[PDB]
C-alpha cells in the first residue's frame, strides 16, 4: 500500500512540475525568434529557459535540499539535458513526430533540430526515445517521479556523497514501484518500472551523444557565441 509519506512525495512532485512547466508556453515569445544554424539562437534560448525550470523543479524534490551545494550542482549539470528531453515529451506529438508548443512558429521538427546543428546521430535516437516514452502513456504522477529519479542519480560524474544521493533516490524509486502496483492498472502496468528504468539508460546514451555534439559545435567560437551564458556554464565549464 502507498504510505502517507509516499503520497505526500507525489503531491509535492506534481505541484513542483506545475509551478515549473507552463503548458501555455507564453514565455517563448521572449526568446530570439525562430528562423527557417538558423534555429540555434531560438533553440539555445529554449534550452536555457528549460534549464532554469529544471533547476526550479529540482529544488522542490524531497531530500534534495539535504545535499551539499556541490552535489546539487553536479547533479543538475549532468542531468539537465536529460530532464529537458524527458519533460519535453509533454510537448511532443505522435501525429507530426514533432514537438508542439501551441503555435506553428513554436512547433519543432527534425529539420529544425538539424538547423540547430544536430546530426541524425543525436536526433534519430532522440525521436525513438520520444516515441517509446509516449507509448508508455505514463500517469502524470509517474512522469514527475521519473524526472526526480533521473536528477538524483548516485553514479553521476563528480558526486561527493553517493550514499546520501542513493538514499534520496531509493525513497523516490520505492514510491514509484509502489505507485504503479497500487494505482496503475494492468495491462499498462506490466513491466512498467523496468521499462521506465530502461528509459533512464536511453537518456544516458542521449546525454553522452549530446556532449559530443556540443563539443563539435563548441569548438567553433562563432557558434558558441550564439549560446546563452547558462548553457555555456552547464555544458561548458
Amino acid at each position: 500500500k502507498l504510505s502517507e509519506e509516499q503520497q505526500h512525495i507525489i503531491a509535492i512532485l506534481l505541484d513542483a512540475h506545475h509551478k515549473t512547466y507552463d503548458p501555455t508556453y507564453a514565455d517563448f515569445r521572449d526568446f530570439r525568434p525562430p528562423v527557417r544554424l538558423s534555429m540555434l539562437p531560438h533553440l539555445a534560448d529554449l534550452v536555457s529557459y528549460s534549464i532554469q525550470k529544471v533547476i526550479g523543479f529540482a529544488k522542490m524534490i524531497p531530500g534534495f535540499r539535504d545535499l551539499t551545494s556541490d552535489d546539487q550542482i553536479v547533479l543538475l549539470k549532468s542531468s539537465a539535458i536529460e530532464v529537458i528531453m524527458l519533460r519535453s515529451n509533454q510537448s511532443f506529438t505522435m501525429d507530426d513526430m514533432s514537438w508542439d508548443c501551441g503555435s506553428q512558429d513554436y512547433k519543432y521538427d527534425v529539420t529544425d533540430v538539424s538547423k540547430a546543428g544536430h546530426t541524425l546521430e543525436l536526433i534519430e535516437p532522440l525521436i525513438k526515445f520520444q516515441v517509446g516514452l509516449k507509448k508508455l502513456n505514463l500517469h502524470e504522477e509517474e512522469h514527475v517521479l521519473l524526472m526526480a529519479i533521473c536528477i538524483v542519480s548516485p553514479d553521476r560524474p563528480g558526486v561527493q556523497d553517493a550514499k546520501l544521493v542513493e538514499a534520496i533516490q531509493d525513497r523516490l524509486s520505492n514510491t514509484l514501484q509502489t505507485y504503479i502496483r497500487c494505482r496503475h492498472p494492468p495491462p499498462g502496468s506490466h513491466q512498467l518500472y523496468a521499462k521506465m528504468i530502461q528509459k533512464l539508460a536511453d537518456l544516458r546514451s542521449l546525454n553522452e551523444e549530446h556532449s559530443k555534439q556540443y563539443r563539435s559545435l563548441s569548438f567553433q567560437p562563432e557558434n558558441s557565441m550564439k549560446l546563452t551564458p547558462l548553457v555555456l556554464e552547464v555544458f561548458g565549464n
Partner: peptide
C-alpha cells in the same frame, strides 16, 4: 566550483 549561475539559481 566554477558554476556561479547554477549555484545562484539553486540557492
Amino acid at each position: 566550483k566554477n558554476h556561479p549561475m547554477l549555484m545562484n539559481l539553486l540557492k
